[PDB]
Design a protein around this motif. Structure first.
Motif, PDB file in Angstrom:
ATOM      1  N   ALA A  62       0.822  -1.212   0.000  1.00  0.00           N
ATOM      2  CA  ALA A  62       0.000   0.000   0.000  1.00  0.00           C
ATOM      3  C   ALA A  62       0.857   1.265   0.000  1.00  0.00           C
ATOM      4  O   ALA A  62       0.554   2.240   0.690  1.00  0.00           O
ATOM      5  N   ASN A  63       1.939   1.242  -0.783  1.00  0.00           N
ATOM      6  CA  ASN A  63       2.816   2.400  -0.966  1.00  0.00           C
ATOM      7  C   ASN A  63       3.394   2.879   0.367  1.00  0.00           C
ATOM      8  O   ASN A  63       3.358   4.067   0.698  1.00  0.00           O
ATOM      9  N   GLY A  64       3.935   1.936   1.136  1.00  0.00           N
ATOM     10  CA  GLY A  64       4.555   2.243   2.406  1.00  0.00           C
ATOM     11  C   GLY A  64       3.642   2.158   3.610  1.00  0.00           C
ATOM     12  O   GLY A  64       4.131   2.251   4.744  1.00  0.00           O
ATOM     13  N   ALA A  65       2.338   1.985   3.408  1.00  0.00           N
ATOM     14  CA  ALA A  65       1.389   1.886   4.508  1.00  0.00           C
ATOM     15  C   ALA A  65       1.238   0.466   5.037  1.00  0.00           C
ATOM     16  O   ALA A  65       0.499   0.256   6.004  1.00  0.00           O
ATOM     17  N   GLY A  66       1.916  -0.508   4.434  1.00  0.00           N
ATOM     18  CA  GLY A  66       1.797  -1.888   4.863  1.00  0.00           C
ATOM     19  C   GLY A  66       3.091  -2.479   5.380  1.00  0.00           C
ATOM     20  O   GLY A  66       3.907  -1.776   5.984  1.00  0.00           O
ATOM     21  N   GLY A  67       3.285  -3.776   5.153  1.00  0.00           N
ATOM     22  CA  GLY A  67       4.480  -4.463   5.586  1.00  0.00           C
ATOM     23  C   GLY A  67       5.483  -4.639   4.462  1.00  0.00           C
ATOM     24  O   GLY A  67       5.156  -4.512   3.284  1.00  0.00           O
ATOM     25  N   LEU A  68       6.721  -4.936   4.847  1.00  0.00           N
ATOM     26  CA  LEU A  68       7.792  -5.128   3.877  1.00  0.00           C
ATOM     27  C   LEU A  68       7.516  -6.373   3.043  1.00  0.00           C
ATOM     28  O   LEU A  68       7.389  -7.478   3.583  1.00  0.00           O
ATOM     29  N   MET A  69       7.425  -6.196   1.730  1.00  0.00           N
ATOM     30  CA  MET A  69       7.131  -7.281   0.808  1.00  0.00           C
ATOM     31  C   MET A  69       8.419  -7.849   0.221  1.00  0.00           C
ATOM     32  O   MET A  69       9.451  -7.177   0.152  1.00  0.00           O
ATOM     33  N   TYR A  70       8.343  -9.108  -0.205  1.00  0.00           N
ATOM     34  CA  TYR A  70       9.478  -9.808  -0.787  1.00  0.00           C
ATOM     35  C   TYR A  70       9.092 -10.376  -2.145  1.00  0.00           C
ATOM     36  O   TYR A  70       7.949 -10.785  -2.365  1.00  0.00           O
ATOM     37  N   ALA A  71      10.065 -10.400  -3.053  1.00  0.00           N
ATOM     38  CA  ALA A  71       9.836 -10.855  -4.419  1.00  0.00           C
ATOM     39  C   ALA A  71       9.814 -12.377  -4.463  1.00  0.00           C
ATOM     40  O   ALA A  71      10.807 -13.028  -4.119  1.00  0.00           O
ATOM     41  N   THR A  72       8.688 -12.945  -4.894  1.00  0.00           N
ATOM     42  CA  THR A  72       8.550 -14.393  -4.993  1.00  0.00           C
ATOM     43  C   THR A  72       8.713 -14.854  -6.437  1.00  0.00           C
ATOM     44  O   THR A  72       9.744 -15.431  -6.798  1.00  0.00           O
ATOM     45  N   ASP A  73       7.703 -14.606  -7.264  1.00  0.00           N
ATOM     46  CA  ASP A  73       7.744 -14.967  -8.672  1.00  0.00           C
ATOM     47  C   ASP A  73       8.431 -13.846  -9.455  1.00  0.00           C
ATOM     48  O   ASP A  73       9.061 -12.954  -8.880  1.00  0.00           O
ATOM     49  N   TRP A  74       8.318 -13.880 -10.785  1.00  0.00           N
ATOM     50  CA  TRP A  74       8.900 -12.822 -11.602  1.00  0.00           C
ATOM     51  C   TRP A  74       8.034 -11.569 -11.614  1.00  0.00           C
ATOM     52  O   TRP A  74       8.554 -10.466 -11.818  1.00  0.00           O
ATOM     53  N   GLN A  75       6.729 -11.711 -11.399  1.00  0.00           N
ATOM     54  CA  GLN A  75       5.810 -10.578 -11.351  1.00  0.00           C
ATOM     55  C   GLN A  75       4.770 -10.793 -10.255  1.00  0.00           C
ATOM     56  O   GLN A  75       3.565 -10.661 -10.471  1.00  0.00           O
ATOM     57  N   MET A  76       5.237 -11.128  -9.054  1.00  0.00           N
ATOM     58  CA  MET A  76       4.348 -11.322  -7.913  1.00  0.00           C
ATOM     59  C   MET A  76       5.136 -11.074  -6.638  1.00  0.00           C
ATOM     60  O   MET A  76       6.120 -11.770  -6.371  1.00  0.00           O
ATOM     61  N   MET A  77       4.702 -10.088  -5.857  1.00  0.00           N
ATOM     62  CA  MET A  77       5.353  -9.723  -4.608  1.00  0.00           C
ATOM     63  C   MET A  77       4.356  -9.850  -3.465  1.00  0.00           C
ATOM     64  O   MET A  77       3.194  -9.454  -3.596  1.00  0.00           O
TER      65      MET A  77
END
Lengths: 60, 241, 207, 236, 29, 253, 41
Positions: free
Chosen positions: C177-192
């Motif tokens: 949410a553009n910094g309003a959420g938690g730190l995301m990690y890259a899983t697939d090639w186009q899915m975080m």
RNA sequence: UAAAA
């Protein structure tokens, strides 16, 4: 601001504004009557770019 | 000076003129062919005004640019030595000066055919070397003669005249001593007409007297137009031949 | 090829004509004789020979990185360099970013926010490697994401040209949410995806 | 079927077990993952089994936010190379109306729209991180009736509540009390714009004055007496 | 964790289901 | 399928480019300079090869205009569309009945048609002349050798010629028919100077004439004979209202 | 250029091959001292 | 500088 002619059978050129079927001059200069084209040649006039002129200029 | 007679029963004012007489009018055209495309040295009475017209040209920045007309800028600079007592203030950014600068732009942006010159800007630079009453009207006549020298298309002349009311007697072309003793009205008449592009009243005037003041004001303004017009006739004839 | 002193100061002569380089300039001096082309150092540091160049700072200042803000300002991102950017504006056909680092690994912190910082533009034609004509930048980047993109042609009238048409290039750090959420990690090639929040957001991952 | 007045930060009277479809006024925290109101208004819910439930908050507002599938009125303020630049509301951001978003669109011919023209379009893109987009034809169904240039007439500025209650709520006694006085055509925009037009200017002005008076007055049963007096005033 | 569908606009919540005419011309009467 | 009209001409078309273009003019009516000196090749100054000049070049820059265009007179409405039928011109006798009708007027509207798929330079296929009362359709395929008589009207300064985007029509009139226009009033340059959003003819017919047109016969093969019923009405519409549009645009200018 | 020009069927034309030799800011190296005084005159 | 066929 002065009246140059009251004949509607004319073509208003540069330095001239039509008004109420009468012709007035917008600048100060001489009257030019070439064919039916009525225009006023101002005294201090700058460069008028026309098609096919060899000019010199610097990039701005 | 001292305690003078403003309008004696002999009809003579403090400087010798009469009720409907104007100060000497000596205008000059094309005084700065090296500093601006338009030039006019206005010398109306003791007043000595230098008016320059730089344009129409491209704006120095593409931010402000009207793609359908031109931009008209007026820079009125009252020098410190304009009066006898050298001015100590700044004058440039004065609130009274910004009102005059704006009143001049509105006055001419409707008279100057800004549509003929789209995407351009017209800078007007004014320097007052000396003032002596009726400075607003002399600012008008200077811009008119300076734009004509620049070859800017206008609908008609714009004449600047100042009129004062002393008791029950109007006075044409008021000097500084007359403005400090009565109400003052500066008019902006368009050509030989009665259309007013400017009407500034800055002191109390009875309503029953304002109409007659306006009539005698526009009448003297036409006289100011002819003196400017006759100056252009003499300047154009001696330049061609 | 090393008879000169170790350190060098602005004005200390190095060697005659050798070729110039970073920190030198051919200055002709006069000593009651003909003008000789003398290479003069113009930086405070040690002289290196390969090609003559004067690198600024001491060996301790290079390992400790005492010239952090001085290294990035002197080394501009040249052609083909891979940089780290931050998304600032999202347009329909481009994505304005802001250059934050550059590598030769080792990097260099940019200028510390206020303007006058190096910015770039990632064109939609260089976002992915396949189907370069029809892409959706809204499904690729979001404002406030750290993107690793390689520079391209230098038409630096105001911005730079970057690309992400590879596997190791794309969003390397983002938040929900553009910094309003938690730190995301890259899983697939186009899915975080963020582990704690469990929410998924479509990006242009790099793994 | 429940409707109660709530406030931002108040508890949400909905069980987490039930499937929910939230809309405007309700926000989902990206951290706590809870559901909380962020607007002051009436909380509307509807439990139906066929088996989805929805919930939203009807709040008072005047600044329009671009949302998809909305009927909006805009003013053309710029002509770019591949799209238009339309202004759905003053001071707000601009929206994109492409030249290809028109009935019988083609690369060869451009639309006949110029600046200052009132257009009626449908919001097809309302991304938060991107510029909003509109179109003069529903790209999902193919509809195009009513969309296009609103030649002449007069536009009216109303709040967003007055726009939704006029387009969706068919029981709003405004178009009915206006048609009883003069024939007209109306264009309802969800951005607070109501475009009207009559045969004579005297009737169009009377429609402008009624919608303005009915916009600030909350009593719905007083719309009959407003137009009764308004259309009587123009007769002098 | 909840059963969350993306926040929808004001138009999709109504019942006519997109068969609404935003520009209604009232002819005669 | 329709055979090529090039094969039925008096002489084949010069596709050799062995010499610069020779104007197909023999009579120069309403001329200030004689046609004699107009038939000399201009010496190749700089790097512009020697070429025959425009026959009416001097006749355009110096000739005065008719007092009909400098005035602001009331516009005259176009004749009724349904209560008027075209006049197909196919023979030399029918052509003469039109020329003397065009000599007794002051404003005419002209338009052309062209085909360039089965011809190198291309061939004109239909001329669309219309006055304030009648609409003509001249078959430029059979009258190709006879259409150079129209220079008596197209070069008459007292008569105004109203085209629309004639940047190609002037080239076709001189390359295939030997015709030249003196006193041109291009409505495209009028719409470009007024400030209209579009400059097409279909725009001026739907805004200044209220003629809902279906522009789909432009790329049609205008060599088929006779012309179909929809095309005969499509060809006359390009110049029927063009005279009323000229009045509305002239007064605004 | 100004010295050599100002004083003295299967062809479909060709395109001229012009390099950046006319766009280079590098002026002529050796200009005559007698010529520069003529330009000032 | 979106006109012509």
């Amino acid at each position: 601001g002065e009246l140059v002619t009251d004949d509607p059978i004319w073509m208003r050129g540069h330095g001239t504004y039509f008004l109420d079927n009468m012709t007035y001059s917008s600048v100060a200069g001489t009257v030019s009557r070439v064919n039916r084209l009525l225009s006023v040649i101002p005294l201090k006039g700058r460069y008028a770019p026309e098609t096919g002129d060899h000019v010199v200029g610097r990039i701005a | 000076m001292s305690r003078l007679e403003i309008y004696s029963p002999e009809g003579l004012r403090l400087d010798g003129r009469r009720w409907n007489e104007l100060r000497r009018f000596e205008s000059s055209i094309n005084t700065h062919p090296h500093a601006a495309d338009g030039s006019s040295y206005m010398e109306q009475g003791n007043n000595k005004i230098i008016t320059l017209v730089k344009g129409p040209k491209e704006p120095r920045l593409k931010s402000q640019m009207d793609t359908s007309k031109a931009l008209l800028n007026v820079s009125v600079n009252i020098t410190k030595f304009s009066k006898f007592e050298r001015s100590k203030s700044s004058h440039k950014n004065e609130r009274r000066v910004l009102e005059i600068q704006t009143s001049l732009v509105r006055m001419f942006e409707k008279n100057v055919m800004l549509n003929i010159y789209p995407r351009t800007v017209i800078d007007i630079e004014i320097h007052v070397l000396e003032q002596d009453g009726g400075i607003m009207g002399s600012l008008i006549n200077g811009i008119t003669l300076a734009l004509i020298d620049a070859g800017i298309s206008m609908f008609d002349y714009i004449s600047g005249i100042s009129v004062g009311l002393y008791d029950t007697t109007p006075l044409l072309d008021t000097n500084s001593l007359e403005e400090n003793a009565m109400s003052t009205v500066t008019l902006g008449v368009v050509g030989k007409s009665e259309k007013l592009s400017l009407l500034l009243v800055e002191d109390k005037i009875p309503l029953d007297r304002l109409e007659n003041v306006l009539a005698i004001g526009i009448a003297g303004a036409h006289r100011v137009r002819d003196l400017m017009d006759e100056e252009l006739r003499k300047h154009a004839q001696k330049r061609v031949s | 090829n090393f008879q000169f002193p170790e350190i060098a100061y602005p004005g200390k002569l190095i060697c005659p004509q050798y070729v110039p380089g970073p920190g030198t300039k051919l200055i002709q001096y006069e000593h009651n004789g003909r003008t000789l082309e003398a290479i003069t150092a113009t930086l405070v540091g040690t002289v290196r020979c390969e090609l003559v160049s004067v690198l600024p700072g001491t060996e301790k200042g290079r390992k400790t990185n005492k010239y952090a803000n001085n290294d990035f300002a002197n080394n501009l991102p040249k052609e083909g360099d891979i940089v780290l950017t931050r998304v600032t504006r999202l347009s329909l056909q481009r994505a304005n970013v802001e250059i934050l680092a550059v590598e030769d690994a080792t990097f260099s912190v940019s200028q510390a926010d206020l303007g006058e910082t190096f910015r770039g533009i990632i064109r939609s034609q260089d976002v992915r490697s396949t189907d370069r004509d029809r892409v959706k930048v809204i499904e690729c980047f979001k404002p406030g994401d750290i993107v690793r993109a390689q520079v391209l042609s230098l038409g630096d009238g105001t911005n730079y040209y970057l690309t992400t048409a590879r596997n190791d290039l794309g969003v390397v750090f983002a938040r929900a949410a553009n910094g309003a959420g938690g730190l995301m990690y890259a899983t697939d090639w186009q899915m975080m995806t963020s582990p704690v929040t469990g929410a998924t957001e479509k990006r242009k991952c790099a793994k | 079927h429940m409707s109660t007045f709530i406030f931002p930060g108040d508890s949400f009277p909905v069980d987490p077990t039930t499937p929910v479809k939230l809309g405007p006024g309700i926000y989902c925290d990206p951290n706590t993952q809870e559901i909380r109101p962020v607007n002051t208004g009436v909380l509307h819910v509807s439990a139906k089994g066929k088996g989805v439930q929805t919930a939203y908050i009807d709040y008072s507002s005047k600044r329009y936010i671009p949302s998809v599938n909305d009927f909006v009125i805009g003013v053309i303020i710029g002509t770019f190379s591949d799209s238009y630049k339309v202004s759905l509301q003053n001071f707000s951001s601009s929206v994109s109306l492409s030249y290809m978003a028109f009935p019988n669109a083609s690369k060869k011919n451009r639309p006949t729209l110029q600046v200052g023209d009132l257009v009626y379009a449908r919001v097809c893109t309302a991304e938060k991180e991107l510029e909003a987009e509109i179109e003069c034809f529903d790209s999902t169904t193919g509809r195009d009736a009513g969309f296009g240039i609103l030649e002449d007439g007069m536009i009216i500025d109303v709040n967003l509540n007055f726009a939704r209650q006029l387009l969706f709520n068919n029981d709003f006694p405004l178009l009915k009390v206006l048609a009883a006085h003069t024939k007209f055509e109306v264009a309802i925009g969800l951005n607070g714009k109501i475009w009207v037009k009559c045969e004579e200017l005297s009737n169009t002005l009377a429609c402008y004055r009624t919608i303005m008076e009915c916009c600030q007055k909350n009593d719905t049963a007083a719309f009959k007496d407003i137009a009764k007096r308004q259309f009587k005033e123009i007769l002098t | 964790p909840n059963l969350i569908i993306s926040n929808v606009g004001y138009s999709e919540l109504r019942k006519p289901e997109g068969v609404i005419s935003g520009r209604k011309t009232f002819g005669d009467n | 399928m329709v055979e090529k009209p090039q094969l039925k001409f008096k002489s084949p078309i010069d596709n050799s480019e062995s010499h610069p273009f020779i104007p197909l003019l023999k009579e120069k009516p309403n001329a200030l300079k004689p046609l004699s000196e107009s038939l000399r090749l201009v010496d190749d100054d700089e790097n512009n090869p020697s070429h025959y000049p425009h026959p009416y070049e001097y006749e355009i820059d110096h000739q005065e205009y008719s007092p009909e265009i400098l005035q602001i007179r009331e516009e005259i409405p176009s004749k009724s569309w349904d209560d008027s039928v075209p006049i197909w011109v196919d023979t030399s006798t029918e052509l003469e009945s039109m020329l003397e009708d065009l000599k007794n007027t002051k404003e005419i509207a002209v338009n052309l048609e062209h085909h360039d798929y089965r011809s190198y330079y291309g061939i004109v296929c239909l001329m669309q002349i219309s006055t304030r009362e009648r609409d003509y359709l001249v078959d430029t395929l059979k009258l190709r050798e006879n259409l150079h008589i129209l220079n008596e009207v197209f070069t008459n300064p007292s008569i105004v010629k109203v085209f629309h985007g004639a940047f190609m029509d002037i080239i076709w009139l001189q390359r295939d028919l030997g015709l030249y226009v003196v006193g041109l009033f291009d409505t495209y340059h009028a719409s470009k100077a007024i400030g209209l959003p579009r400059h097409s003819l279909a725009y001026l017919l739907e805004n200044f004439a209220n003629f809902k047109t279906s522009k789909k016969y432009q790329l049609a093969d205008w060599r088929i004979r006779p012309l179909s019923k929809p095309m005969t009405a499509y060809a006359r519409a390009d110049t029927h209202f063009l005279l009323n549009i000229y009045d509305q645009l002239r007064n605004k200018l | 250029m100004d010295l050599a020009r100002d004083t003295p069927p299967s062809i479909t034309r060709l395109e001229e091959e012009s390099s950046w030799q006319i766009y280079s800011d590098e002026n002529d190296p050796s200009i005559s001292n007698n010529i520069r005084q003529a330009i000032c005159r």
